[PDB]
Paper text:
ClpAP, a two-ring AAA+ protease, degrades N-end-rule proteins bound by the ClpS adaptor. AAA+ proteases, such as ClpAP, consist of a hexameric AAA+ unfoldase (for example, ClpA6) and a self-compartmentalized peptidase (for example, ClpP14). Here we present high-resolution cryo-EM structures of Escherichia coli ClpAPS complexes, showing how ClpA pore loops interact with the ClpS N-terminal extension (NTE), which is normally intrinsically disordered.
In two classes, the NTE is bound by a spiral of pore-1 and pore-2 loops in a manner similar to substrate-polypeptide binding by many AAA+ unfoldases. The register of this ClpS peptide is very similar in each structure, with the C-terminal portion of the NTE (Pro24–Pro25–Ser26) near the top of the ClpA channel, and the N-terminal portion near the bottom of the channel in classes I and II. In classes II and III, the relative height of ClpA subunits was A (highest) > B > C > D > E > F (lowest), whereas in class-I, subunit B was higher than subunit A, resulting in a shallower spiral when aligned to the bottom of the IGL loop and the two flanking ClpP subunits.
Author numbering:
A (entry chain L), B (entry chain M), D (entry chain H): 2 to 192
C (entry chain N): 2 to 191
E (entry chain F): 475 to 749
F (entry chain E): 665 to 747
G (entry chain E): 475 to 569
H (entry chain A): 570 to 664
Amino acid sequence: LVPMVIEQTSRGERSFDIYSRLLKERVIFLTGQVEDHMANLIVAQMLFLEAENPEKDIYLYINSPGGVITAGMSIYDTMQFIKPDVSTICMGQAASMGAFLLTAGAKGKRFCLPNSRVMIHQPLGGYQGQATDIEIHAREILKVKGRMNELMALHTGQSLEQIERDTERDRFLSAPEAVEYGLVDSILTHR
Amino acid sequence: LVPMVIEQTSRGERSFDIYSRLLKERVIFLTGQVEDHMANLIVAQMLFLEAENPEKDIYLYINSPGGVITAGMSIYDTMQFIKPDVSTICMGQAASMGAFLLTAGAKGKRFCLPNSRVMIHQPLGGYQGQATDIEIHAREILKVKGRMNELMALHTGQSLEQIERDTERDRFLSAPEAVEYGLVDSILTHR
Amino acid sequence: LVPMVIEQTSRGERSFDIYSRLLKERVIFLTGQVEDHMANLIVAQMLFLEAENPEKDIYLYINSPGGVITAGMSIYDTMQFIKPDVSTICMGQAASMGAFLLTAGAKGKRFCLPNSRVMIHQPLGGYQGQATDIEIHAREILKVKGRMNELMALHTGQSLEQIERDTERDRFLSAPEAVEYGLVDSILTH
Amino acid sequence: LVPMVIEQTSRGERSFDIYSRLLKERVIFLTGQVEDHMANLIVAQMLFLEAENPEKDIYLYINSPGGVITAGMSIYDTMQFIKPDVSTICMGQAASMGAFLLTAGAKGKRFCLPNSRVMIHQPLGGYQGQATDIEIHAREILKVKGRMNELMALHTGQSLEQIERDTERDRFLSAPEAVEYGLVDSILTHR
Amino acid sequence: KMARAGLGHEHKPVGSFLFAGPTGVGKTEVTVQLSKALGIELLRFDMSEYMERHTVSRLIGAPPGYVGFDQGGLLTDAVIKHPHAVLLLDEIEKAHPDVFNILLQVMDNGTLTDNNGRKADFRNVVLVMTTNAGVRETERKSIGLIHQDNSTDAMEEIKKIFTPEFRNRLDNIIWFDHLSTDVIHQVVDKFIVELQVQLDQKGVSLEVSQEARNWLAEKGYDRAMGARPMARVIQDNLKKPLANELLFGSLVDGGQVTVALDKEKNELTYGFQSA
Amino acid sequence: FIVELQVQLDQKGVSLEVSQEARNWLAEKGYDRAMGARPMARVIQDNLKKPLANELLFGSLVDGGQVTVALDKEKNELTYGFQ
Amino acid sequence: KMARAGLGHEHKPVGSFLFAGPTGVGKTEVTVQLSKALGIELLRFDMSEYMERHTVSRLIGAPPGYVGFDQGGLLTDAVIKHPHAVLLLDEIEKA
Amino acid sequence: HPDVFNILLQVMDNGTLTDNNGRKADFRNVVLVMTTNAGVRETERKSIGLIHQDNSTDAMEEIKKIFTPEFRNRLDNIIWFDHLSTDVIHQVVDK
Ligand SMILES: Nc1ncnc2c1ncn2[C@@H]1O[C@H](COP(=O)(O)OP(=O)(O)OP(O)(O)=S)[C@@H](O)[C@H]1O
């Protein structure tokens, strides 16, 4: 069960969940596999925080193993649209989609824990049906692959040609190596 | 779980769910495969907003990957008889029902994000039984496909023959392509 | 999950479910396959609204895909029994039982959305057992079939012989076409 | 999901579930197959109403397709034991167990909807095992059938021999026929 | 007009008025002019301070001293001191609901009873109120990917904030239209004219360009705050630069001043001549 | 209520005559089942007293001391004749 | 009538009556239409105001050593000032 | 107590005050200044997150509530004081 935390508000004591209390501090946790329903919650959280105080920056702690690419795009599109800088702090693990969101964070606010491990690979999708349907369905997969390389390369800063070869197969980048690659500005070794 | 959000009022502090607070601002979220159970919730939300303030417009995000033909029409039908304009900002992904609902939004209010993918395919259904029953069922289900093209033609503005050719097989449209085809309009993207 | 929508009252603010808030406005929502538990919920809601204000009419949104025939009859009898007119609104697919509730609605207030479809078919069920047992069950469904056609014909006003011909074979009717049959008084312009 | 309803009181608004609000007016609801757990709730509701107002009558709405005989006996015993006269209204359909409870209603307050269907038949309880065990179990089931037929005969008023003939096989009965048979005093007439 | 005709109950108060919109909607102006036109002393009590048990006691209690018995109710004695004086109330939304209930009592019976035993008659006083609920809701932005106007009807806010009986006893809900840009331009001229007359006594002459008045109008005036910021904006912008020169500089004698703005940098340029 | 209004006007010197049909219309709108006769005082106050007061200060009532109350069937709104 | 005749309660009030009926049916008016006819003072207290526990101290006054000791009870002051009068309590249920 | 604010209000607007003797005091020459400690209140606790977030107190929230609006409006300027910077603190060491 989620623990309950009490906030020492002057008007009266306020009861909150651990996630809700942290959300009041513009902290959002991207935990679990990427999905349409879970992604919707993150979008709703970002919208609420931006309206409450667009001047303050929003934080995103990514500890997800990846998932559906389409669901993740909603988070990516909303991250740039909202005025608050979407800080991305990779924690524990960053898969292809999780890594994509990590780079999406505002420049200068992207961080990785000292022992955090990142993984980047090409989207995996398959379709079954008539030959004509597979060709058109397959074409969209390749088209999407180009789109991810373009957006990832822009934030990372790596050349498009290098991204294709690296993205062809799974690439595990340790936290120091991620800074070299350009995924994160620096590592939060200690306070 | 849904995090709680505190809205400050003159009377005093109040707590609402993240989905509930967004609904208070005439924001409705459509997620997952459309169905009678979920569609009724969206229909219920629209009816409540109309009674609360018919003057103010409503919003409807579309992240569904598909749905049920019958369930989707219920949401579309509601939009027709309610005075508030139902904005349709596609988030992440659209499909046969999502695109129909997305284009259904009032002209000038419909929108789509840059990375959202809008898929439009003809309705597909399977039925078995007596030969006489299949023949009558086949003509009626085919009529629904024709109805979709006629309704789709009105919002898109293209001829029913053009939409039928494009919708004969699964079609994937990029966000710029979708705007050019009349399905949606470009977001302001200004802050 | 369902959103919670607050209400405005002189005493203060009361939180309500989206379904409960609409109920305050004499609006009932019907969805999913008809069931004994589901039918009891609609019946309880109708009885409560009647007591609250008999003069004020009630509204019902039917999106049923069909269900138990016996469960649906409870809603029909309760609907006829209650004094306020029930403004049945077909917002989605309506099966044989769902369509019957639409037709059961008080004449002069029935409505159907322009794109919604209404399917009517004969009641169908399967029973396995001894030759004597199937005949008993066959008579019941045959008797019920006549009752459904007779009651549907009464509300619609169509000839009982003609409706039975259409009911035996699975058929679909569009909202404009339904007006001709008499299932719904008229479509909603807006 | 059950909708909530507010009842006005001098002190202030009171929120109760739809089932509880109707229970306040002495309207009990019986639904689904009879069982020990649901029967426990029904008898609990009857006892509570008796203490609140013994003079006022209790209204049981029977919409069950049949259930275990043992659980039903508890409801039958409680209904007869409590001083308030229970009025059983058959909603939708009444099976062997539902019909037995419906007949148990105090004379002069039993009703059947015009479209309701009442079905009465012998118990279907069975047991398997050693021949000695089946013989003892076989003897017990006859006693329940004899006891059930005798109890039904008392309320309906038919002879014991007549009830046995009607319950030898499934006997579906219409609502108007029930009045002639004597299961219910009279049909409920709509306004 | 009803009171002057006399076709009304004697106990009922002379008039009931209401005001809505942002702070500084001419509540002081119209009330001061109304009081002047009617020749009744203007009495104004601010509900903004009545937010605590001690402060809310002030209406019928004697905050200055418990030993003091002459003052009694400060609001009540004010009516007694001047029978015809108008009572101006502002930001009543803040006050507790219990305090607002006493207002309903006097409105119905047109009389009040102090704790000390004094009786006050409201038959000769007009009661007006000011509400600023609109600014709070409209400034807030909708929680959506695309923003929407959050303006709401003033009458809607009065209904939710106050009890239904208050509106029923109240003769009518009066909503004052919002300020217009033309009035703001005139307001800027009035302040410059006020500053101009003040300088003429010292012997300094100030000339302001028409474009300068418009420039101050856009940044100074605010929709939420009405014309209150424009007043403050005119004081710091004009009094501060000349002040240094008046003590020592070109403006010590002659007092020749010119005010103009530069379109390229969009900043006011001040020209000082010794004269 | 009309008698009270008529008595008040009589002291001022104005005579009021109200049509019998007009009284029936006022009764339905003024009286509410849930609120009983509570709104009847407000309806009579706003509808009748406010217009008459305007003429009393200046108009037909100040010069002639006569007034009449009528109902408009098409508009279902009371009409007052001042003389 | 019995009170004037000498058959009224020696220590209890002249009469205690509770009117339970729909609002606006004249329950309140009977009280104000009897004082004018009898030519006696009318004492009316708004029970709705006395909706909290602290409010009861207002009618009887605060005890010695408190802020409200100086101010006498509202109910006691009114009845002492007007011994012969009609006491009207409205919305007693909300009290 | 707020009673003093009334004396300051009269002193500020009229520019003179009368004591028991009734002599008139000239406040035009004197310059009146006050020091309030409402601004000391600050949110010392840092954000609940890996990265600390700056917190800004609402401008004059406590000052607005504690003082009356008419008195506050009369004040020409409610001067504020910012926290001493690290570089500024070095200068203080020399003093
Ligand atoms: N039988 C009656 N004859 C004449 N007037 C009546 C009668 N019954 C009720 N009224 C009127 O109904 C109005 C309200 O009745 P009350 O019993 O005083 O209720 P109330 O809720 O206290 O009313 P307010 O003070 O107007 S909110 C008054 O105008 C009464 O004179």
